[PDB]
Amino acid sequence: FAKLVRPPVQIYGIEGRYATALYSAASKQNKLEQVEKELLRVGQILKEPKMAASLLNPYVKRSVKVKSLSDMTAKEKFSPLTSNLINLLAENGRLTNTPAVISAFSTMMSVHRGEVPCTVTTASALDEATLTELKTVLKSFLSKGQVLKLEVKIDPSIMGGMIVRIGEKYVDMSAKTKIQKLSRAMR
Amino acid sequence: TTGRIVAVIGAVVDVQFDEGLPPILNALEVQGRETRLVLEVAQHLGESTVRTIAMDGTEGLVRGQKVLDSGAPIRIPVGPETLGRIMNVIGEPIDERGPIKTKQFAAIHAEAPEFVEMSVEQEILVTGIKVVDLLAPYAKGGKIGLFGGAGVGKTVLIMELINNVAKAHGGYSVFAGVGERTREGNDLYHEMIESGVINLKDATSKVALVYGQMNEPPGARARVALTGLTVAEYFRDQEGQDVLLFIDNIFRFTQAGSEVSALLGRIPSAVGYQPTLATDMGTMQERITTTKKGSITSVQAIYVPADDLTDPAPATTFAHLDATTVLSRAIAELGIYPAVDPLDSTSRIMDPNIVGSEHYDVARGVQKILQDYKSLQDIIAILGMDELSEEDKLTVSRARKIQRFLSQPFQVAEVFTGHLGKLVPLKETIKGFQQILAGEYDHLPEQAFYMVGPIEEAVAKADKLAE
Amino acid sequence: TTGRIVAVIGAVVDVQFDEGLPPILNALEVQGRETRLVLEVAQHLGESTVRTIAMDGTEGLVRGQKVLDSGAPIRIPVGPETLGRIMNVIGEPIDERGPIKTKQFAAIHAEAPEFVEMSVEQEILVTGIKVVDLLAPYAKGGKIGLFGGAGVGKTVLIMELINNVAKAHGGYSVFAGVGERTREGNDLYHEMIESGVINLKDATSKVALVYGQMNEPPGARARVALTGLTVAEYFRDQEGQDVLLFIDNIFRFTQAGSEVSALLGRIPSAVGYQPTLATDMGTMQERITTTKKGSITSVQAIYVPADDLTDPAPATTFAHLDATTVLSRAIAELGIYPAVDPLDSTSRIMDPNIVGSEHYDVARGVQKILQDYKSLQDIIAILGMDELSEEDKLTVSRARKIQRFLSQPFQVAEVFTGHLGKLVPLKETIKGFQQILAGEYDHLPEQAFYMVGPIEEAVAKADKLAEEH
Amino acid sequence: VSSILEERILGADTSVDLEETGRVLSIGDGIARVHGLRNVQAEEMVEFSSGLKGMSLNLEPDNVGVVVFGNDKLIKEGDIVKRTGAIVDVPVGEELLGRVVDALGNAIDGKGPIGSKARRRVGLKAPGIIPRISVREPMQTGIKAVDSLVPIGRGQRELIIGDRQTGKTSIAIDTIINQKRFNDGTDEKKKLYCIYVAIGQKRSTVAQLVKRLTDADAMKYTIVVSATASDAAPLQYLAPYSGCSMGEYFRDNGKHALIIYDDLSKQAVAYRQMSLLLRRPPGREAYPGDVFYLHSRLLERAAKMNDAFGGGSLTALPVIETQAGDVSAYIPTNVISITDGQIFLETELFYKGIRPAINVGLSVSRVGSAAQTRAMKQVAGTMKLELAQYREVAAFAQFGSDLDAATQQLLSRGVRLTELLKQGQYSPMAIEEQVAVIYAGVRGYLDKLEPSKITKFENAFLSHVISQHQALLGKIRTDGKISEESDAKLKEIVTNFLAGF
Amino acid sequence: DPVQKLFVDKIREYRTKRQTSGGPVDAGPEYQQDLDRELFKLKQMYGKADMNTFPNFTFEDP
Amino acid sequence: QNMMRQKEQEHMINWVEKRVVQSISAQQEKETIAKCIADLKLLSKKAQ
Ligand SMILES: Nc1ncnc2c1ncn2[C@@H]1O[C@H](COP(=O)(O)OP(=O)(O)OP(=O)(O)O)[C@@H](O)[C@H]1O
Ligand SMILES: Nc1ncnc2c1ncn2[C@@H]1O[C@H](COP(=O)(O)OP(=O)(O)O)[C@@H](O)[C@H]1O
Ligand SMILES: Nc1ncnc2c1ncn2[C@@H]1O[C@H](COP(=O)(O)OP(=O)(O)O)[C@@H](O)[C@H]1O
Ligand SMILES: [Mg+2]
Ligand SMILES: [Mg+2]
Secondary structure (H helix, E strand, O other): OOOOOOOOOOOOOHHHHHHHHHHHHHHOOOOHHHHHHHHHHHHHHOOOHHHHHHOOOOOOOHHHHHHHHHHHHHHHOOOHHHHHHHHHHHHHOHHHHHHHHHHHHHHHHHHHHOEEEEEEEEOOOOOHHHHHHHHHHHOOOOOOOOEEEEEEEEOOOOOOOEEEEEOOEEEEEOHHHHHHHHHHHHO | OEEEEEEEEOOEEEEEOOOOOOOOOEEEEEOOOOOOOEEEEEEEOOOOOEEEEEOOOOOOOEOOOEEEEEEEEOEEEOOHHHOOOEEOOOOOEOOOOOOOOOOOEEEOOOOOOOOOOOOOOOOOEOOOOHHHHHHOOEOOOOEEEEEOOOOOOOHHHHHHHHHHHHHHOOOOOOEEEEEEOHHHHHHHHHHHHHHOOOOOOOOOOOOOEEEEEOOOOHHHOOOOOHHHHHHHHHHHHHHOOEEOOEEOOOHHHHHHHHHHHHHOOOOOOOOOOOOOHHHHHHHHHOOOOOOOOOEEOEEEEOOOHHHOOOOHHHHHHOOOOOEOEEEOOHHHHOOOOOOEOOOOOOEOOOOOOOOOHHHHHHHHHHHHHHHHHHHHHHHHHHOOHHHOOHHHHHHHHHHHHHHHHHOOOOOOOHHHHOOOOOOOOHHHHHHHHHHHHOOOOOOOOHHHOOOOOOHHHHHHHHHHHOO | OEEEEEEEEOOEEEEEOOOOOOOOOEEEEEOOOOOOEEEEEEEEOOOOEEEEEEOOOOOOOOOOOEEEEEEEEOEEEEOOOOOOOOEOOOOOEOOOOOOOOOOEEEEOOOOOOOHHHEOOOOOEEOOOOHHHHHHOOEEOOOOEEEEOOOOOOHHHHHHHHHHHHHOOOOOOEEEEEEOOOHHHHHHHHHHHHHHOOOOOOOOOOOEEEEEEOOOOOHHHOOOHHHHHHHHHHHHHHOOOOEEEEEEEOOOHHHHHHHHHHHHHOOOOOOOOOOOOHHHHHHHHHOOOOOEOOOEEEEEEEOOOHHHOOOOHHHHHHHHHOOEEEEEOHHHHOOOOOOOEOOOOOEOOOOOHHHHHHHHHHHHHHHHHHHHHHHHHHHHHHHHOOOOOOHHHHHHHHHHHHHHHHOOOOOOHHHHOOOOOOOOOOHHHHHHHHHHHHHOOOOOOOHHHOOOOOOHHHHHHHHHHHHHHO | OHHHHHHHHHOOOOOOOOEOOEEEEEEOOOEEEEEEOOOOEOOOEEEEOOOOEEEEEEEOOOOEEEEEOOOHHHOOOOOEEEEOOOOOEEEOOOOOOOOEEOOOOOEOOOOOOOOOOOEEEOOOOOOOOOOEOOOOOEOOOOOHHHHHOOOOEOOOEOEEEEOOOOOHHHHHHHHHHHOHHHHHOOOOOOOEEEEEEEEOOOHHHHHHHHHHHHHOOOOOOOEEEEEOOOOOHHHHHHHHHHHHHHHHHHHHOOOEEEEEEEOOOOHHHHHHHHHHHHOOOOOHHHOOOOOOHHHHHHHOOOOOEOOOOOOOEEEEOOEEEOOOOOOOOHHHHHHHOOOOEEOOEOHHHHHHOOOOOEOOOOOEEOOOOOOOOHHHHHHHHHHHHHHHHHHHHHHHOOOOOOOOHHHHHHHHHHHHHHHHHOOOOOOOOOHHHHHHHHHHHHOOOOOOOOHHHHHHHHHHHHHHHHOOOHHHHHHHHHOOOOOHHHHHHHHHHHHHHHHOO | OOOOHHHHHHHHHHHHHHHHOOOOOOOOHHHHHHHHHHHHHHHHHHOOOOOOOOOOOOOOOO | OHHHHHHHHHHHHHHHHHHHHHHOOOOOHHHHHHHHHHHHHHHHHHHO
C-alpha cells in the first residue's frame, strides 16, 4: 500500500492503529498542530451529556450516529482530516474508545516535539531550589534539543533518597531499597 | 530493503518492513549477530509485517534489530566444488575446510519440472548389486525406500550404492541428512573418508554431504532436504547425469514440517501432523524425477512410527515410493551381506512390460523357489529332513544355492571381508540366476557361490575349494 | 481498600479496584451477603482489575457490589482449640457449637520447608494389616497414598488406619476431607465421638476435622486441602508434636482446580486438566513432608478415574509418596478385602537394611510366587489345570493360599462381612508367610486362609471346616 | 559474631546505576506481562522490584511475556521490572563438587556459599561435527547387565527408559557410586565427575539420595542440581541446562563428566505449562512444537571432544518414565530418536526376581562392540549370543521336558546366565570381577549346578577371588584382555573352586 | 566510606548492640521456648547419656 | 555452639533492622537530598 510515515513512538491496540493512521495522514499536509487542537476540541465536544449519551446507546442506528457526528463537525468546522477520522470511528463502531485515540495521539505528538517524560518521587516534601537543581541536572540526561516534562511526587512510604524516572531509564536511590539490599546481601 | 524485528516468540520471528515486503519464502539476514542467522518468510500479516521462521537459535534477538532482505529464497552454492564437503541448510560449510568456492548459486525453492519435461519411459537403474538389481530393481527417477534399522549394514549399502553409481553410470551423488545425530554425522563422515567416496586430497569425491543436525531449530530441519535437492538438481540440469540422493531420515522431514506448522499456529491435522502434510511431501518428492536432461534417483530411509503403516506420515510417503529395500537382521546372522531381504523387497517396475520377459520370469521364479523353501523350512524344523521327498530336497538345495548367490562382496567393505568388490552387471546376474534355477550347478558346494560376483567366479571357487 | 464486582461468570468473579490492588492470594469479603462470601484473588487482568475464585455459591451477586480487601490470605484459627471441631475451607465452625476461641490465626498459603530442614530418617510403621505391613511397610512420618478406583475400599482402609493408628498415637491428628460424600462426614464424626477421640464435654479431643465435602463450589474444594494442611502444619511446627494427617480424596483437589481453570482463561492441557497441574500439586504436596521440627504421617486417599493409573492426576501424584498401596478391583471382586494389589504396591523402606533379611526375603518370595502364578494362568487358560506339570500345581496352590491369606477382617468391616476385627503383629505375618512359602501348610485347604488373622487362626479354621465336612 | 557482622555489612555493593525498566501490566499463573523493556533481549534475566527473577521469554510487539522464578504472590500489576542485560548463566568449576545447588547455581545445602570464579551461559550450542571423535572409551557402570550386554561408552546418550518404580534412579546411582574406584585412583583419564539433576522429585527424595551418596562417600566428586516439585515451572524447565553447562565446563576442560537427568519427562511437563500459559500454540498431547528442539538441543551437548579440543567428554543418561510400557507416547519417542541407545526396564522382570529389571530384548546400544574392554568384549559376545538363543525359545520353558536335548541345553544355559546377571543394590563391581563371573558362567562351569544356588556361587566366588588372586585380576585390568595364560589361570581357579563347593 | 549514612547507621546500631551484649537484648521468652524445643530434639538425636564424663563400658568377651 | 551462633545471629539481625526502621525517621532529609543530587551529578558526568 501507499508508504506511510511512522510515528516516533509506537502505541498498540485499537487506539494504536487509529492514532498511527491519523498521525501519518497529518504528517502529510503538515497539519499536526491544528489536528491536535481539533482533537482536544472533540474531546470535550464528545463529553456533553446528550452527545455522550447518544453515542453509547447501541440502539441508535449507525447511520444516525454518523450523520449526527457529521452535523456536529460542520458546526465545529473541523479540518477534513479530523472530520474524516471522527466519521471513520463512527461507522467502524469504535467511537466508544475515542478518548483512547486522542490520548495516544497526544503521546505521539509530544514525542514529536521532544518532551521526554520524567518523574521524581521524593522521600517527603521537597523545596523548590532543590527542584531547580534537579531540573538543571536532569537536563544533562536528555539529548540535544529534547525538553523535560517533570512530574514531582511526594512519597513518605519510601524512607529516604529518591526515585528518578527518565523515559524508561530508572535510577533508584531511596534509603528503603538500600536497606533491603544491605539486609539481603547480609542474609 | 531493511525491516525491523517486532516480535520473537520462540523460534518464530516477526519483522516489520515499511518500503516493500519480501515475497513469501524469501531469506532475510538478521543484522547484528555474529553467527549468520537467516529467517525465511512464511506469511504476510498485513500492516507491512511478515512472520518469518528462524533457521538458527533466536536467543539474544532484540525488538528493533535490523533485518535485511536478501532478495531471493535461501541460496546455496551448487558447483562441482560442493562435492566431498559438508554444508548446513543455508549452504555454509561446517567441515572446517574453508569456503565452498563456487561460481553458481541456486535457490532451494524451485518448482518441480513441468509436464513437458517429464520423461515418459520407465528405465531401470543398474546399481550393480545382485539382490537389489534382480528382485527389487531401482528405477531411474524413482523414490526408492530403504527400510530396516541399524546394525544391518545400512551405511555400507549407502556407500556401495554411491560408489557403484559413480563408477557405472558416471554420476555423482548427494546425502541430505535431515535430523542427523551429530555423533552419527561425524561417524558417517569418517566412514566415507575411510571407504574413499570422500577424498580430501585431490578433489575427486563422489558425495556432497548436507547436514541438518538434530539440534538446529525446526525451521532448519524441514529445509535441509531441499538443500540436497538443489545440490542434486544442479548436477541433473547443468551436467545432464544420473544422481543419487539419500535422505536419512524421511520421517524427520515430516516431523520438522509438523513442528513448523504448529509454530505458525495452524490447526493440527489427523494425528497431530500439519494440515499440509500431503502437499509438503509432494512439493519435495516431485522434483525427484527423470527429465530429459538427466535424472535424480533417491534412496530415502523410512521410519514407520509404532509399526503403523497407516500412520499419516508413512502413509503419505508410500504414495511416492517406487521401490523398497527391507534390510533385515535375520538375514545378517546367516552372514548374507547385503542383508537385503528378497521376499519383502518390492518394486513397482518389476513388471514384464518394463524390465523384460526374461528378467521378470527369472525374478518371479527366484521368488517362488525362495517362498517354497521358506515353507519347507517349517516342515524340516518340525518333523525332520526325512519327512521330505527328493522333489522337495532339490528345491531346498536350489534355494540354499540362491540364498548364497544373492550375497555380494562390496568394494567399500574390503576392510571387513578382504574380498574384492564385484560390480556384477545386470546381464551377468540374470544369467547366473537363470542357470542356478535350471539346475546347471546343482552339484557344486553351496560355498562355491557364497560371496562371489558373477556365476563364473562361483565355478572357479568351487574348483578351488574342491581340491 | 474497597473494589467493585464487574463480572460474575460461573464461579469466577472479576472485581475492579480504584485504590491499590490486593496482591495475589489475598482474601476479599463481598459485602451485603447473609453468609460470609470470601473470594481469593488469582490474577491481575490489567486495567486495575483482578479475577477471583469464590469459596461459596455466587447466587445473588449483583454487578457493582462493594468488596472489601481483607489484607492477608485466608486466615483460619489454629491451636489445640480446633480439636474435635469441624471447620469450613475458611475455618468457621460447621458443627453448630459456637466460635473457635483461639489465639493464633494462620494463613493457608505458606511455603514448603527448605532443603536444609528435611529429615532423612525413616523407620517402619506397624498398621496391623498383613498385606500392607508385609509388602509395602509404611514409613513413620512419611507420605503414603491409597490409590484405586471407586468402590474398591479406600475409605474403609482409611477408616481402619484411623481406628488403629489414631488412638494408639500420642500426638494430635487431623482429617481433612476434600470433596467426598457428606454422608461419610457425619459417619466419621459419630464414629469418632463413639471412640472418644472427640469429646463434646472436656478438652481431651485428639482429632481435628476439616470438611470441603463435594457439595461445595469448586473454588472451595481446591483450598480445603490447604486448610487441613495448615492446621496440621501448625501442630507440627508450633506445638513441637508428631501429627497424623488423613486426606480423602486428594484427587478432588486437582479436579476442583480443573473445573475453574478454563474460566480463568487457560488453554486446557493433556486430558482437560489445567495446564498447571504438576506445580499446583507440588506447592501443596510439599508442605506435608516431615521436617526437623516435627513429624507428619500423611495418609492420602487418591482416586483414580476409571481405574486408569496412567491418568495425569495419579500419574503425577506417584512422585510425591513414600509408600503407594494400589488397591485393585480385579482383586476386590475375588473377595480379597483389602483389595490391595501385592505387585503394584511399593514402599521406600523395603530395603533389607531397614526391615532385615527375614522380612525382605519373605516379601520378595511372596511377590515372586504371585508373579509366577500370573504367568501360569495364561497356560491354565488353554490346558486346563490337569495337564499342568506336577511341580507347577504346587506353585499354583501355594500362590492361591498366599493370595487368600493376605485378606483380613477389618474392625470397621464388622457390618459388611459380619466378622470380627483382627490385628496381626508384624512378626506373626512374617511367620505365617514363611510357613506358607516353605510348604508347612501344603496339606490344608485354600478356604482355610480366607479372612483370618494370624496363621494359627488358619489352622483352627481348617479344623472347623473339616469337622462339618 | 558481631565482629563478623561488621564485615558482613561492609562487604556489600551499595552503588546504583541507570538501568532500563518496564512496568508489569498483568500477572497470574506465574506469567508477568511486562510493558516497556524496549531493549530486552529474548531469553534474558529481568528482576522484579520485590526481589524475584524472571526470564523474558516471549517478546511480543507491545509487551514482553516474562516467566517468574517463583510464586508471583509477591508481584502486582504496577510493579517495576528492571532488566539486567545478561542471558541466563550459572556458576561452574570444581568448587561445586560435593555441593547441592538449585537450578540457578545457588547452594541450597547451607554448608556455606559456592566459591566459584567463572560463570557460563546456559544456552550455548553443542560442539560441531569436526570437534567430536568417535566413541571409544567405556564408562563402567558397575552393573553386570548394563556393562556387558548394553555397553555405554563415554560421550554417548543412553536413555534409561521404563515404567514407574522399576529401578531407574537405582541404576543411575549405582553408576554414580561405581566411579569411586577410579576417582580415588591416580589416572586422570578414567576419573568421571558425575552430575545428578533432580527434576520434579520431592525434597525428601533428593535428601535421601544425597544421604546415600554421602554414605558411600561419593559426593566428593558429584554435583547434585535440584529443581524439586515445589520450584516454579521455569526452575524445572531450566535445571537440565544448568547441569549440562556445569558438565560442559569439565568437557571442554579436558576432563570426563557424566550427567544424569531424572526425569526428562518432568521437564517437558514444566515447559508445557510455561508455553500453555504464555499462550503459545499447543500440539500433540498439548506439548508445544519445541518439545523436540527442547530436548534435542540438550542431549546433543553430550559429546566426546577430540584430542585437539582437549579430549574431554560428557556422557548423558536421561531417565524417562513411560506410562505402562507406552513407548509410543510423544515424549518417549521424542527422546528415543535423539539418543544412542536405551536401557529398557520392565516390571514383569522386576517381580520375577530379575533385578536390575533390564529387558535385554529391547535394550540396545548403537555404539555396541566399541565402548567395551577387550576382556569384557570376549566374554560378552558369547554371552549375548547365548542369551539371544535362549530368549528365542524361552517360550517352551514351562515344558522343558518332552523336548530335544539341544533346546534343553539352551534353556539350562540361559537360566544360568539370567541368574548370573541378577545383581544387588548399590553393589557395583569392577570390570575384572564381572569378567571373572561371566567367564565362569559362559564357559559351562555352572551348567551342572542347580539354578537356585547360582547367586550363592557368584558371591562366594568373588570372595574367593578378591581375597586370594588379586594378582590375576590386576593382570586382567591393567591390560584389558585375556591372554592365554590368564585364560587358563581363570579356568583353573573356576574348576578348583567349583570342586571345593 | 562514611559518606553513606546507611553504613554509619548500621554500624552504630551494631555497636550499641554489642555494648548491650552484656546479655542477649530483647531475647523474648519465645526465644527461650525455641531454645528449649530444639535443644531437647538435639539431645535425643544425641542420646540420653550424661554429657559430662566418659561413659564406662566394661566390654564383654565371648 | 553452632546453633547458638546462628540463632543469636538471626536475632541480632532482627533487632538491628528493626532499629534501622525506627531510627531512619531521624532528620537527615536535606542532607540526603544533597548527597543524592551530587550522585546524580556524578552519574550524568560519567554518562557522557
Ligand atoms: N538391583 C536391585 N535389587 C533389589 N531391589 C532393587 C534393585 N534396584 C531397584 N530396586 C528396588 O526398586 C525400588 C525402586 O527403585 P528406584 O527408585 O531406583 O526406581 P525409580 O523408577 O527411580 O522409582 P521412581 O520412578 O518412583 O523414582 C526400590 O525400592 C528398590 O528397593
Ligand atoms: N558386505 C558386507 N560384508 C561383511 N560385513 C558387512 C557388509 N555390509 C555390512 N556389514 C556389517 O554390518 C555392519 C554395518 O554397520 P554400519 O554400516 O556402520 O551401520 P549400520 O549397522 O547401521 O549399517 C558393519 O559393522 C559390518 O560388519
Ligand atoms: N474389608 C472389607 N471387607 C468387606 N467389604 C469391603 C471391605 N472394604 C471395602 N469393602 C466394600 O467396599 C465398599 C465401600 O467402598 P469404599 O471404600 O467406600 O469406596 P471408595 O474406596 O471408592 O471410597 C463397601 O460397600 C464394602 O462392600
Ligand atoms: Mg470414599
Ligand atoms: Mg527415581
